[PDB]
Amino acid sequence: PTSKKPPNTAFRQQRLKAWQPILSPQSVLPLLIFVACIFTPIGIGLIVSATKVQDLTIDYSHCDTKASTTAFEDIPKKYIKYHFKSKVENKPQWRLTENENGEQSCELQFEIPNDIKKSIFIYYKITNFYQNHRRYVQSFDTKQILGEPIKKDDLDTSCSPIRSREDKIIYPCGLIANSMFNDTFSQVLSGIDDTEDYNLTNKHISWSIDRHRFKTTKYNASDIVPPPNWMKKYPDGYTDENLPDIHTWEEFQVWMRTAAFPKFYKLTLKNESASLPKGKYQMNIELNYPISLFGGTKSFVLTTNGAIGGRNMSLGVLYLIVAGLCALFGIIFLVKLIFQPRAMGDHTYL
Amino acid sequence: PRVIHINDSLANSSFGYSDNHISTTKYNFATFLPKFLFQEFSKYANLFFLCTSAIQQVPHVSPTNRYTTIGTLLVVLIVSAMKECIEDIKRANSDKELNNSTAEIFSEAHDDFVEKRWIDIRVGDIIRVKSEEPIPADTIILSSSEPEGLCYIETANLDGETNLKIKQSRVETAKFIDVKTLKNMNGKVVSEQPNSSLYTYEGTMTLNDRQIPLSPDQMILRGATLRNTAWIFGLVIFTGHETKLLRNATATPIKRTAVEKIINRQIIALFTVLIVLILISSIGNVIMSTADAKHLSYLYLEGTNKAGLFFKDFLTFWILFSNLVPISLFVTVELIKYYQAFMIGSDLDLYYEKTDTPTVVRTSSLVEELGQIEYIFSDKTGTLTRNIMEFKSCSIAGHCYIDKIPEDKTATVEDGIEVGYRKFDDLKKKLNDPSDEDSPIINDFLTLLATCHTVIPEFQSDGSIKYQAASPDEGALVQGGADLGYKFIIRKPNSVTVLLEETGEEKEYQLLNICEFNSTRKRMSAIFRFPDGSIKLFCKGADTVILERLDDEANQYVEATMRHLEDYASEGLRTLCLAMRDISEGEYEEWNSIYNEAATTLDNRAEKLDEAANLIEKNLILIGATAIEDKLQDGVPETIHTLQEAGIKIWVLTGDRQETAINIGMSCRLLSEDMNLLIINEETRDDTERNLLEKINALNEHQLSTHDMNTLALVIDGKSLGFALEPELEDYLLTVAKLCKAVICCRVSPLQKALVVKMVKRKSSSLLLAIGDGANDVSMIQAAHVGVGISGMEGMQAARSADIAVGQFKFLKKLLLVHGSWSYQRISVAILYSFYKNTALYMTQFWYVFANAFSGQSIMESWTMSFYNLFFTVWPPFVIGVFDQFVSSRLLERYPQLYKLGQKGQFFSVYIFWGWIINGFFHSAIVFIGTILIYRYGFALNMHGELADHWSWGVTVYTTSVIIVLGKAALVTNQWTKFTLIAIPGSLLFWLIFFPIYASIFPHANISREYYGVVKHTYGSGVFWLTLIVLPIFALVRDFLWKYYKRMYEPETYHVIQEMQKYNIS
């Protein structure tokens, strides 16, 4: 019958070409030396690249209780964080303005004594805002933001706290698109005293995939109602002109992008292909979002995009830390090779 | 009582007796479900998953699908069931080869023997058995082709023996020759219940005339084999599992491995870690929801009592963190243990050439515990010896004659009297011419070697002469006398004709009287006449009884023969001294009367036959002594020595005599001529109790040293062990057995072979191994942790119910040292690497709850995390636990002490398990800290001011955690072959290609639509590529240095062997 003999292949008999790696003293020390000599220049380059970024964070919070209405008053030191190539002379200042009704505003006067040649970006920094909560990340009807007019019982359960109010559909349901930051920033840096204006824009600030997936709604103007927190600007429900399309509303798209940490930036304005000359500038911010809603800080950030975005030494330090571990152990292992003879072998304690 | 009819197949069916089938299978078609559930749910991870699936059924508390864990538990159960079904199908296919052998049955409606299978015999059918055919079932003999009715049955499978057992038939119930005239068998038989008490049978057959008693002298059991006969007629009494031998043997039990019992204790610690994490997360969530309740009004919480929220948070974080215990582990481990058991049974060094039966592993669950064996319980007849007796050396006139002179002594020394070795050609040349002084003595010795015996000759059809002897030593002596020149040819009452090679002349001796062999006399004597008119008497036997039978008065050839016997017995040769005497007829005229009066007493014949011969011993003329060796298998002493060098204590358990098991041990070098033999042969309980007490007292009075212990052996008798095994005071036998180098038990029942193993394994913490041959050591195989059986030779029941079936005993040297130390090292790391690789990823989910108000939001999604242990981190474990070897095979057989590394827990334990979990926490913490610092506020992109969000950051964490575990697998790998270059560096290239394709065609199909544009924000950036070089190196810089330090400045015993293999310098 069958021979029942196993084959003589190199696989069945377990005999294949191997390598057998041994961490010899002439293989680990040169490796560590090479790793250090490689990670030192890239470390220095990533460290110096974060110093070329000039930014100005002005915590405009507490404007309604610490700023005067008569004239401009100096801002405390615990609210300003500026990093420029040069050095400012006059400290930042701020003022509270009360116009008609109760729409108050904060006017911040700052200085740019550097003549920035990079593209300028303007974000706002929100602190202690848990946008990554488990019941907050997935809280929006994907088909409803796609332009399709969804029915009553066909909405997805993510919009669980707010969805239907007295047999009426809400166009932007969910936890998101309800707590949107509604502080309108001035679209121009008003130059004062021998300085010109600096025009800003809020177009093409969101992702290229958000402007392609946020379609104009096809809902009925008499079948939908605004969210509960959108009633101060959309009274008596929605009308024919009161229908905010999410295609051109790029602030809605930039806020719908859920962040990963409680401290996050959100792009509002930008200006490219133009330099920012030196001098005094003024920024007007309408106060509409109270900090008591989340118990954090509302800042105004004016930055320039660098190689890794903003001043962040966290990337260049690591490249210098590994080298600090390669020029240390790689040295204490070399002094143990010449000052402490090691036995060759043949000392098996069998 | 058990009643059985003689000749009918209609009434015996009303009793419901068992058939003649055997079932060595583990599972049956009516017990698969409960046994499989008890085997699978005996672990602590399957129960954990079953309890987890019961939590998702609670409403609201299940965030994901409700069939995410039970659907996977069903998959692992189906995989385990498929493996067990394949193993059981193979076992049943191996079993089927026994129930299909030929077996003739007598039919009443046919009046002729019909050839059937071994499964159709019922209780009470006439069976005709030929020569050299295994007995189908417990048959009482009824007829044979011999005068009065005689047959020789070899019971080498019932219990280890070498001599043929005599069996006969009753009077008036033995004339049933030929198939015809078998119709007048009417009546019934009453016997006792089936019991394993061998050598005992009581009952009576109620024939149509009167009753005929029974006895164990005509009761052939299943397992014996007819020898030197033609055919026998048997009536089946017991069958199937009712056989006295195959009674205590049960189905294959659930044998747990020491690795599984350690894993069970490793899962418990993971449960405490999980409970701590869940408690921390729940307390944090409750505190955050209670204290900071006014600063989280944008989430619209329900708002209930703290007691109603703590339970919900606990239930949620149960499923949220339930992935710390990997499900793919207990499936990969099964496939690894199944693949490494198939590679073992495909090695040419464990494959027999002259039989073509390679090694098989019919139990792939205990393949990894082959490198942790501390005790080996062997067997003599069939496992160590080849059951072949041959005439090796001879002693004549104080001179040793040997066919091939060895190199230990070679020539003689001639100190006082000649002592040494000389070739047989000298004997031939001295026998040729009659001018030598030892020619007549050698002549009489040669006539002794071919006359005084009970061997029956038979001329075959081809012309070869065959010998039939109930004792193999007598047959070996006859063959030696034949091939030496005196070929015994024909025998018939008062006639023995032997052909002489010289001159080609045949002789003729008138055999007058011959005394039978008894256990008390221990002699074989034969008195006859030579063709000249003189009476000569020969007598051969052991040197204990015949020394007091002769006196010294002229033959000064005694001390030389004593030295020769002492030199022969010091090697394991069964010796027999021989004596001749020439006496006249003046004493015979009354000797014939005093002998034949023993045939007149009709009351006690066994009392007169032995004393009738004890009257003709005045002064015997000692001729010399013989040597009959029992050949061992190929490479038996070397294997025993190698296994004793590796720290394994080898025992021997045989159901043979003590004298035959003593010299078996001096030949394979298990014993020596200088060790103290603690022989314990006691007849009562108090005797063996006092013997054990005085032995422990004599062994405790000394302080012991490097000697003393290596020269100590423990020989135990059958009934003495039965008294030393009782639960009342049994530690006295165990405290002394651990101080002897070797233990040998003799005349042990098949039940005691398992009792010894069960006593050793329950009063210690060592791993046992039971190797045996034949159906007499089957229960022992089913009593140890690893049961190895011998397949090929006489007897296969021990190889069908075992776990590994080898062909030779020497293979055990490579199955344990090479294929045992590897499987213990392969299955260890392959497990320890998984528990680590599942910790270095899912622990970031616990470091992230401090940044999302303790909500439990996952960093990655479901589909990406589901592919972690399925597509990208599944091949390194397989290539580590199957195709990896830390040392070459030629070095594991050179240094057996390395086996001790697997003998103690040096590669897999709970303390080492903490070293991989803590290392997994460190890497995950490093990844999390490095990722939350580079991505400050998402402002880590130089692409027109756009920022990175949640999903664009989770891809960096998932990619960084993949390079780290592959780096650890690379640092662990000791071989680096062609199968490794596709599992560690090929799995990294797989993810880097799979991610852009998956994240660009699947979000369009409404499947995981969160990766809509992350490929631009991850692959298109320069920061995502700068992190994958600085984080996996910063996280793996601690192991790369510690490995070098441990290999260089604190080298272990295997670190030097690995270095010896690299540079090839000893």
Ligand SMILES: CCCCC/C=C\C/C=C\C/C=C/C/C=C\CCCC(=O)O[C@H](COC(=O)CCCCCCCCCCCCCCCCC)COP(=O)(O)O[C@@H]1[C@H](O)[C@@H](O)[C@H](OP(=O)(O)O)[C@@H](O)[C@H]1O
């Ligand atoms: C404040 C400033 C601090 C400055 C610190 C500066 C310097 C510190 C110096 C050293 C750091 C720590 C050093 C630890 C001290 C000694 C290391 C002992 C390493 C050790 O043998 O056992 C390991 C424990 O696994 C960790 O490695 C344990 C890793 C533990 C390291 C970190 C301990 C704390 C971790 C807590 C994390 C929690 C973070 C939580 C933070 C949350 C924040 C959000 C596990 O075995 P192993 O895989 O290495 O395998 C070894 C060996 O590598 C291998 O070559 C041998 O042969 P083979 O080649 O054939 O296999 C093999 O037989 C075996 O001997």
Ligand SMILES: CCCCCCCCCCCCCCCCCC(=O)OC[C@@H](COP(=O)(O)OC[C@@H](N)C(=O)O)OC(=O)CCCCCCCCCCCCCCC
């Ligand atoms: C290039 C050549 C590469 C060849 C590589 C071959 C590798 C495969 C080679 C597969 C060899 C497998 C050997 C054993 C390895 C472990 C398998 C195992 O353990 O199986 C259980 C379970 C895992 O479940 P769990 O992870 O433990 O728990 C989930 C939990 N974390 C959660 O949240 O749900 O699996 C299943 O239940 C079967 C259904 C899987 C469906 C997903 C695959 C979709 C395929 C389709 C996915 C889309 C594919 C798109 C392809 C473009």
Ligand SMILES: *[C@@H]1O[C@H](CO)[C@@H](O[C@@H]2O[C@H](CO)[C@@H](O[C@@H]3O[C@H](CO)[C@@H](O)[C@H](O[C@@H]4O[C@H](CO)[C@@H](O)[C@H](O)[C@@H]4O)[C@@H]3O)[C@H](O)[C@H]2NC(C)=O)[C@H](O)[C@H]1NC(C)=O
């Ligand atoms: C900018 O964003 C601010 C925070 O997102 C937002 O301030 C909130 O505005 C909403 C909308 O008016 C306020 O919600 C109302 O609160 C009052 C209690 O103070 C409720 O009574 C009221 O419900 C009413 O329900 C009545 C029937 O029971 C009925 O008359 C109406 O249906 C009415 O809705 C609202 O729920 C909320 O208190 C404001 N503060 C906070 C901290 O949320 C600003 O309005 C917004 N401004 C702009 C210009 O967008």
Ligand SMILES: Nc1ncnc2c1ncn2[C@@H]1O[C@H](COP(=O)(O)OP(=O)(O)OP(=O)(O)O)[C@@H](O)[C@H]1O
């Ligand atoms: N052909 C023979 N004629 C006489 N004596 C023999 C022959 N062959 C072997 N012997 C001797 O017979 C003796 C047998 O002693 P035995 O082995 O019978 O004691 P036991 O071991 O007490 O028997 P059991 O244990 O089987 O009841 C051995 O010492 C052996 O030398």
Ligand SMILES: *[C@@H]1O[C@H](CO)[C@@H](O[C@@H]2O[C@H](CO)[C@@H](O)[C@H](O)[C@H]2NC(C)=O)[C@H](O)[C@H]1NC(C)=O
């Ligand atoms: C660039 O900035 C200037 C300065 O604000 C903008 O001019 C203003 O336009 C608004 C809109 O009608 C007027 O109400 C202001 O009075 C204008 N200010 C001045 C100083 O002229 C100008 O519109 C901006 N450009 C664009 C394209 O928006």
Ligand SMILES: [Mg+2]
């Ligand atoms: Mg045997």
